[PDB]
UniProtKB/Swiss-Prot annotation, chain B:
Residues 4-112 form the HIT domain. AMP binds at S12, D29, N85, A91, Q92, S93, V94, H98, I99, H100. This is Adenosine 5'-monophosphoramidase HINT2. Exhibits adenosine 5'-monophosphoramidase activity, hydrolyzing purine nucleotide phosphoramidates with a single phosphate group such as adenosine 5'monophosphoramidate (AMP-NH2) to yield AMP and NH2. Hydrolyzes adenosine 5'-O-p-nitrophenylphosphoramidate (AMP-pNA). Hydrolyzes fluorogenic purine nucleoside tryptamine phosphoramidates in vitro. May be involved in steroid biosynthesis. May play a role in apoptosis. Its EC number is 3.9.1.-. It comes from Homo sapiens (Human). It is found in: Mitochondrion. The keyword Acetylation applies. It catalyses: adenosine 5'-phosphoramidate + H2O = AMP + NH4(+). The active site is at H98. The chain holds residues 52 to 163 of 163 of the full protein. Keywords: Acetylation, Apoptosis, Hydrolase, Lipid biosynthesis, Lipid metabolism, Mitochondrion, Nucleotide-binding, Steroid biosynthesis, Transit peptide. Optimum pH is 7-8. The modification N6-acetyllysine is found at K68, K88. The gene is HINT2.
Amino acid sequence: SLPADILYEDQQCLVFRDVAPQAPVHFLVIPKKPIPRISQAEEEDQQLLGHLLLVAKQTAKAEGLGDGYRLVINDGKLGAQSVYHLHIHVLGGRQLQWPPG
Amino acid sequence: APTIFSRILDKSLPADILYEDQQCLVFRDVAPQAPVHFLVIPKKPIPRISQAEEEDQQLLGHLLLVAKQTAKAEGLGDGYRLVINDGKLGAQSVYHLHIHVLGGRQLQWPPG
Ligand SMILES: Nc1ncnc2c1ncn2[C@@H]1O[C@H](CO)[C@@H](O)[C@H]1O
Ligand SMILES: [Cl-]
């Protein structure tokens, strides 16, 4: 993993490639505020959460995902959350299946 | 009207509604992929997340907070998954923005 694997950074968030990718494009959007899980976000996080989704879709465009993609947020053990910090997964570059896990 | 979600919003198609306010509507998915499977949609007919814009920032955050609030109400304390599909490769199918909330079983990886 190299510095260029950070695709985007601002005062609110970091975007970086997943080193265990599940699709030809697979990156991760995280807040800099250490919200551990989406179930523990609060009303004060409204604007931040909206920003994370906008950054996810902006980065998807930058990564050439013009034919579609999937955003995923995992909560807790049943969601298969792998790190207790909020992550938005963005997957693209192949046909995504249904159900989504 | 662009999609069947327009009928859910105007109540001409009866749906199992879990939450409603002036910005969004939450209802059960009629082809559920998990023991709990519901959709959070804006009343503003944004067709796809790739077509959301900066003016939608507040709305988008609100949709996520409503998703997690409703997940709690539905008893998803041991975990759940939120999914937003964009376009054909995302398997979106209905072109009105919606967040899937799935819980009540172990979710697998990869997520499709
Ligand atoms: N009339 C409906 N009521 C609730 N969910 C629906 C309806 N039509 C489609 N969906 C769901 O919306 C998603 C996009 O097609 C799928 O999960 C699908 O089952
Ligand atoms: Cl995760």
